DNA sequence: CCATGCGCTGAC
DNA sequence: GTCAGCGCATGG
């Protein structure tokens, strides 16, 4: 297996791939957090993202995307997600992300000279993204390949707060999923909705 | 030890 | 559709 600071494609999971729960995209090593949506270290990069319609000022434009950087959110009370209520900050997450950028982390943001240079990202869409986006698969999640950042920024996002964005684009040989070259490769490649072990049986009598 | 957290399940 | 909160993995 590879190292859990590992760049780059999983080995044997082509893009396409399917899962149904997060905890099987991290058993699998494509996002190892289970719940958070960026993987990354602070002096390294981030390895991977899940576009899950977490975040109001996403904007998924399928090769092309503006990821919002997480925090700027209380979350006292035991809770894991909730709207805006205070400035993202360029720290944890935020700054592996920016990192992979192929140019100097910059605290007011920067742009790559190259960005095919950039550390390579990996890159899945949840179902939940479906709601604003049409590049969301229908259900579960769904390993769609490598991308780079090819810039980040600070701006003041939907709530009035800031928050961190970037952008990505795609740079992967194999075809988006979406599109009929992707379908037809997922189809010849067998790839099917991966559920946990006896999960369909429980499913039903629910 | 402690912060973070783009989930998930059940009750309206 | 809202919404309250819990275990756990990862990073530091």
Same mark, same amino acid.
């Given at each position: 297996i590879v190292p859990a600071n590992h760049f780059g494609p999983?080995?044997?999971v082509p893009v396409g791939t399917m899962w149904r729960f997060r905890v099987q995209v991290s058993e699998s090593g494509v996002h190892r957090p289970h719940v958070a949506g960026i993987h990354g270290r602070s002096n390294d990069g981030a390895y991977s993202l899940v576009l899950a319609g977490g975040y109001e000022d996403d904007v998924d434009n399928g090769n092309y995307f503006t990821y919002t950087g997480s925090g700027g959110r209380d979350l006292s009370g035991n809770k894991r997600t909730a709207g805006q209520s205070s400035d993202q900050k360029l720290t944890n997450n935020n700054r592996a992300l920016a990192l992979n950028c192929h140019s100097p982390i910059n605290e007011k943001g920067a742009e790559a000279e190259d960005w095919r240079q950039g550390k390579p990202v990996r890159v899945? @869409?949840?179902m939940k993204g479906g709601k604003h986006s049409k590049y969301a698969p229908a259900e579960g999640n769904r390993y769609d390949g490598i991308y780079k950042v090819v810039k980040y920024w600070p701006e003041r996002g939907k709530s009035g707060f800031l928050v961190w964005r970037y952008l990505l684009? @795609?740079?992967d040989t194999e075809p988006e999923p979406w599109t009929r070259e992707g379908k037809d490769r997922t189809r010849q490649l067998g790839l099917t909705m991966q559920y946990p072990e006896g999960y369909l049986?429980?499913?039903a009598n629910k």
């Open positions: 999983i080995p044997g899945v @869409r949840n684009r @795609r740079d049986e429980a499913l």
